[PDB]
Ligand binder design. Structure first.
Ligand SMILES: O=C(N[C@H]1C[C@@H]1c1ccccc1)N1CCC(Oc2ccccc2)CC1
Ligand SMILES: O=C(N[C@H]1C[C@@H]1c1ccccc1)N1CCC(Oc2ccccc2)CC1
Lengths: 316, 316
C-alpha cells in the first residue's frame, strides 16, 4: 500500500537555468501528475502512487518548487502562480508529454486549477482535493478577504519573511507531529496566531504521534525539510496580490475539460461549502466527498481517496 | 534533430545497494528501452529518441552499467550477462513496468537478445542493431572461437585489466575521434592489436573530425568517460566463459515474441552474414538492412534507422 523512497524511480527536469523539479515515477499508461500542498512532499502521495500505477496509470509525483529535491530559490516572486504554472508546462515539454491529468491537494490544488484555466491544452483532466476553484473578484483585493474571514490569521503570520520560518524550522519533528494530525487530534488554533506570537506558542512541546502517521514517516519529512527549509514553501503564501492580478486576466473563460472536486468533511481551512457554487462555472464537474476526513486527506483516508480517483480516471 | 542533455528528463533507479542505473526519458505511450554498446552512451541514441517519442512511444535511453551517470563497480563479475539482465529486470520492476520493447546495439544488442531468451515475460518485442542472435554452442570454448577469427584479436587485448583502460583513457578526445568514424574514414585496423601493443599504435596523433560528428558531440563523450573511465565498459568483454555457461542453460528455448534484426553493410566486426541463419531459430523474424553503414549505425544512418524502427514498432 505504500512507497519506499529508495525503491522509486527518481526523475529530474531542469525547467530553467536556476531550477530543477524532482519527481518520482511509477507505472505505464496515461500520465497523471500529482501536486502536493503545504508543507508536504511527493511522499504525501505514498498511498496513491502504487494504487494509481496498479490501476493502469503512469504516475508522476512531484516535489513542488520549494520542496525536497526540487530547487528552492529564495525570491518570493519565484513562487507566484504564473511562474509556477509556466514551469510545470515546461516540465511536460522536457518530458515530451503533450498532456497530463493533473491532481492536486491544497496549494497544489490551486496550482492545478490555474493549469486547467490557462493551459487547458496541456491538461487532459483536472482533480482537486479540498481546494475549490473560485473565479477571481476584480473588485475586492486579497487583503479584504482575510478581514472577511478571521480563520486566515495564520496567513498574515506567514507574510513577513524570516518570522514563520524560524518557528517551523526550530524543531522539525515537533512541527510535523503538530501539523499532521486527524482533525479530532488537533493541537493547534489557526485563529489568533499573530497576537499569540506563533503557531506553536502554547501547543505541546512533545506532541504525541497521530494515528495517521508513524515515527518513520515523520522522520522522512524531517529529513526532506533539512535540505531547503521553510522559506520556499512559505513563499507560496506571499504572492496574493500577484496571483489576484494574474487570475483577473482570464475572467471570461471557463474550464471545459473533465474536472473533479473532492471535499473533506473536517478540513477546517478548506471547508467543503467553499466549493458549493463551482457548478456555476463547471456544470460537468464531478464530485466526491469524504466523511470523517481532515485536512491531510491522502494520509487520513487513503482508501477513500484511491477509490474516488480511480473511478473518476477510468470514466471521464 | 538531436537531444540537448540539459533539456532531457533524467531518471535514476537504484537496482541494488551499490548500483543505480541512469536513463533519459522522452514521450508517452508504450515503453521502449534503448541499450547502447561499447564504448557509447545513452547519447548515441540522440537521433532516435525524439523520432520514437514523436512516433508515439515512451523512450527510456539507458546509460548501461559501467557508463556515464550509471554506477560502475570495479569487479569484472558485475558485468556478466546474468547480472546485467537481472538488473534490467529490477529496473523495470521499480519503474512499475510489466513489459518493455527492448532495442539494443552492439553489446546492448547481445543484452536484449538474452533478455528475450531468459525474461520473455518482461520483453514485449526485441530489436537488435548489428548484433546477431547465435544460440550457444555447447562444444566450443569462448577462447576457442577467436582462434578461427583474427579480426577479434582486439578482444584478447581487452582481457588483461588496466592495459586497454590506460590506452583508451590517456587521451579521451583522440579515442573517440579515432573510433567514431564512417567505415570509409577508418584510421584503425583490428588485425594484430596484441603484438602491435595497443589499439592506437599506428593511427594518427590528432585525428580529423569524422563527418558523422561535431566537436561538441565528441566532447560530450569525453565528459562522460571522465567520471568512470573504461574499466566498467571493458569488463563487458571479460566474462566470455561465464556468459557462455549461462547461455548453455537456454538451448531449448526459442524467441517467440516479435523480433527485428538490422544489419549494417560496412560494419566490419558485426558483419551482416553473421546473422544469415537467424530465421532457423526465429521464423517470424523481421529484418532491416542499411547500405553504406558502418558500425556506428545510429549516428551513421539515423534517418534509415528511424524509418526502420518506427515501421516495425507500428507493425509488431
Ligand atoms: O493555508 C492553506 N493550507 C493550510 C493547511 C495549511 C497549513 C496551515 C497552517 C499551518 C500549516 C499548514 N491554504 C490556504 C491558501 C490556499 O487556499 C485558498 C486560497 C485562495 C482561495 C481559496 C483557497 C491553499 C490552502
Ligand atoms: O567488440 C565488439 N564490438 C566492437 C565494435 C566495438 C569496438 C571494437 C574496437 C574498439 C572499440 C569498439 N563486440 C564484441 C562482443 C559481441 O560480438 C560477438 C561475440 C560473440 C558472438 C557474437 C557477437 C558484440 C561486438
Amino acid at each position: 500500500t505504500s512507497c519506499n523512497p529508495s525503491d522509486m524511480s527518481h526523475g529530474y527536469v531542469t525547467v530553467k537555468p536556476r531550477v530543477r523539479l524532482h519527481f518520482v515515477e511509477l507505472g505505464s499508461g496515461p500520465a497523471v501528475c500529482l501536486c502536493h500542498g503545504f508543507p508536504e512532499s511527493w511522499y504525501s502521495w505514498r498511498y496513491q502512487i502504487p494504487a494509481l500505477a496498479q490501476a493502469g496509470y503512469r504516475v508522476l509525483a512531484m516535489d513542488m518548487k520549494g520542496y525536497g529535491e526540487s530547487s528552492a530559490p529564495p525570491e518570493i516572486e519565484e513562487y507566484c502562480m504564473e511562474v509556477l504554472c509556466k514551469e510545470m508546462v515546461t516540465f511536460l515539454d522536457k518530458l515530451g508529454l503533450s498532456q497530463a491529468v493533473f491532481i492536486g491537494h491544497d496549494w497544489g490544488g490551486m496550482l492545478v486549477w490555474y493549469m486547467a484555466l490557462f493551459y487547458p491544452e496541456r491538461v487532459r483532466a483536472v482533480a482537486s482535493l479540498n481546494t475549490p476553484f473560485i473565479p477571481a473578484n476584480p473588485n475586492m483585493s486579497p487583503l479584504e478577504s482575510i478581514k472577511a474571514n478571521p480563520v486566515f490569521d495564520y496567513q498574515l503570520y506567514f507574510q513577513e519573511p524570516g518570522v514563520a520560518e524560524a518557528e517551523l524550522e526550530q524543531n522539525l519533528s515537533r512541527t510535523f507531529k503538530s501539523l499532521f494530525r486527524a482533525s479530532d487530534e488537533s493541537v493547534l488554533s489557526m485563529h489568533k496566531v499573530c497576537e499569540a506570537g506563533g503557531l506553536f506558542v502554547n501547543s505541546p512541546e512533545e506532541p504525541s504521534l497521530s494515528r495517521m502517521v508513524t515515527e518513520e514517516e515523520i522522520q522522512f519529512y524531517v529529513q526532506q525539510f533539512k535540505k531547503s527549509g521553510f522559506r520556499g514553501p512559505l513563499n507560496w503564501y506571499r504572492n496574493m496580490e500577484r496571483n489576484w492580478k494574474w487570475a483577473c486576466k482570464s475572467l471570461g473563460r471557463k474550464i471545459l475539460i473533465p474536472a473533479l472536486m473532492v471535499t473533506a468533511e473536517k478540513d477546517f481551512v478548506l471547508v467543503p461549502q467553499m466549493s458549493q457554487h463551482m457548478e456555476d462555472w463547471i456544470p460537468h464537474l464531478k464530485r466526491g466527498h469524504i466523511e470523517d476526513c481532515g485536512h491531510w486527506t491522502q494520509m487520513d483516508k487513503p482508501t477513500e481517496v484511491n477509490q474516488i480517483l480511480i473511478k473518476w480516471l477510468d470514466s471521464d
